[PDB]
Ligand binder design. Sequence first.
Ligand SMILES: [Cu+2]
Ligand SMILES: [Cu+2]
Lengths: 172, 174
Amino acid sequence: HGYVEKPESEFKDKISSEWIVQIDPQWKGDWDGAKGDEGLVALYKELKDSNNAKDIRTLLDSDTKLYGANCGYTNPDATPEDPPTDGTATFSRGIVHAGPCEIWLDDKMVLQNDDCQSAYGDGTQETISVFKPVDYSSCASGGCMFRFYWLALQRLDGKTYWQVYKNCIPLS
Amino acid sequence: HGYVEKPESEFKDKISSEWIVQIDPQWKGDWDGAKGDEGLVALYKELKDSNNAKDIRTLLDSDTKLYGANCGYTNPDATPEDPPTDGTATFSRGIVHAGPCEIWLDDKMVLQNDDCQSAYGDGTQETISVFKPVDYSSCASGGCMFRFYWLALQRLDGKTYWQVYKNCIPLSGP
Ligand SMILES: [Cu+2]
Ligand SMILES: [Cu+2]
């Protein structure tokens, strides 16, 4: 759960920290047989390779009925805001689910990791997750759309689920 | 997870300890706000009272799309077997989810609890769950269908779900 807080996510309607969808894994594999967070991540990395996938955006953007609405619950129509000046993005809390995440500035993939839980925080909810480094130089011209993608790999009584989080924030 | 082991569940095809369905709570209430297993059970009891429900079978039988196929993955047309002789039924493992369960022999409800995790075992998977007491006397003349229902109350990241478990086992008379 959570949303990007810097830059500040905006909502048209209700504020929500929830995933946009929560579905069965769509890449065929032995998801249920993986040993814990490290197992889910390791399997993800293995399936990423054999599906020939360079990033999660391509997958998550390919079908909004299966992978959820563009921008999730966030509002791309919001008043654009100034990019951060410190080369970071900040989540609204600590990431406590394993899985890959990505930041794009328009068509430029500026940050990517197979397990953002370990890369950008300490796995506790208390420690704010800080996405860094982020180069916002491509935005200084005429702005950009900041897009955040996160695929959390989750378990409920032995069964693995994919949770999809999407945020969009316009920058000037 | 699990299935009734005594009497012995027979499976239509694949053997499965899984629920037949897993769905949003269908009774409106503050399911996500309940504090743990104790809270989930306490909330069930309140909504049971206000929905005027005497059992879970009526609800779970009312819509077999929403609440899953009759008999789950089990075969009610298996060779009938002799009822247990010791006034008990045995689960295939220990129950480790909170929530109500009940046992019917045809239209007779012979066991019910709002929280079978605490009533019929110790909350560990290792300790086998044993439903008791069960009176099988109605099966003597002409056999009976044994039905097990269980509504498990589960959380996944602050969101509550209902898991529905159903087993049917045919028992013989003399
Ligand atoms: Cu979450
Ligand atoms: Cu289970």
